Design a protein around this ligand. Sequence first.
Ligand code: IYH
Ligand code: MG
Ligand code: ZN
Length: 313
Amino acid sequence: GLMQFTLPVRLCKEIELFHFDIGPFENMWPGIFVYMVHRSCGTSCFELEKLCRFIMSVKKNYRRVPYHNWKHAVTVAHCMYAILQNNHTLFTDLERKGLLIACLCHDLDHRGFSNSYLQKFDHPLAALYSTSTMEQHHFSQTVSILQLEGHNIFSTLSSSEYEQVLEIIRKAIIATDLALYFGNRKQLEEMYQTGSLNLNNQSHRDRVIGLMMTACDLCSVTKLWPVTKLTANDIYAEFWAEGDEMKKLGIQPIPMMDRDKKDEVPQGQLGFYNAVAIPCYTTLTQILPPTEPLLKACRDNLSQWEKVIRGEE
Ligand SMILES: O=C(O)c1nc(C2CC2)cnc1Nc1cncnc1
Ligand SMILES: [Mg+2]
Ligand SMILES: [Zn+2]
């Protein structure tokens, strides 16, 4: 129990900041995650032997896709870490445990295709789960891994604590379905403004955890410009493949997915920042003020995309 993960000095310092990039050395990402669990949660939260076996099984069940891959999983978990570390007293013991695990598992077994494509293809997952198709799959895969011999990192919780943490994880993973974020954020906006927001109301905390999940999930737009811009290529490599697969079902895809309309990307990023990212981080910052560096970094990246359109890069 006296075995800490320690990082080199640069990483030990930058890991605390919202804009930390986990680096290109895949072999360091498990250690980076255990480091975050230890500081967020404690060295006691999980049996190290069980946690390492859980992490490696989660890693194996992420595929080799350009964006929805193991690096995304760890990156999203790091944003959650930075949120929890800057909001120390707002969250329960169980919540800290549940949310880092939910972020690590939230895109398990992703194939690089949207819920929409699965439904037009008539994928069996679309018959099994008619809404939030991939997200109910990601939660399914999380439960499957937790039930492997040796992989139950929660085994030392009481029965009722075990049911509560799995319910935190299920709601957190379902909330990463962006179709649900629009109405979740509108409701949090009304509640914060009329002043009815109450973090002791469970249904309210649920909504706030959902928004934290959207914020961590989108956190590649809150990095320094060179990171955000190089990540945007990874996300468009998936979108353009999905577009090709739409054309193979005889369906003109949306322009966001059409590789023949690469010129329209800068304007599509503006729409995404203005309709999704900026409002997400604004409402998050209103509810949890120390998350403001995410909103500041998002606004800087919006201004960089505006510079791309004005031909200045
Ligand atoms: O551009 C987008 O439409 C986009 N959409 C989603 C969500 C649908 C999966 C995530 N991120 C996105 N943009 C993005 C930019 N730069 C870096 N990482 C993501
Ligand atoms: Mg997802
Ligand atoms: Zn994701």
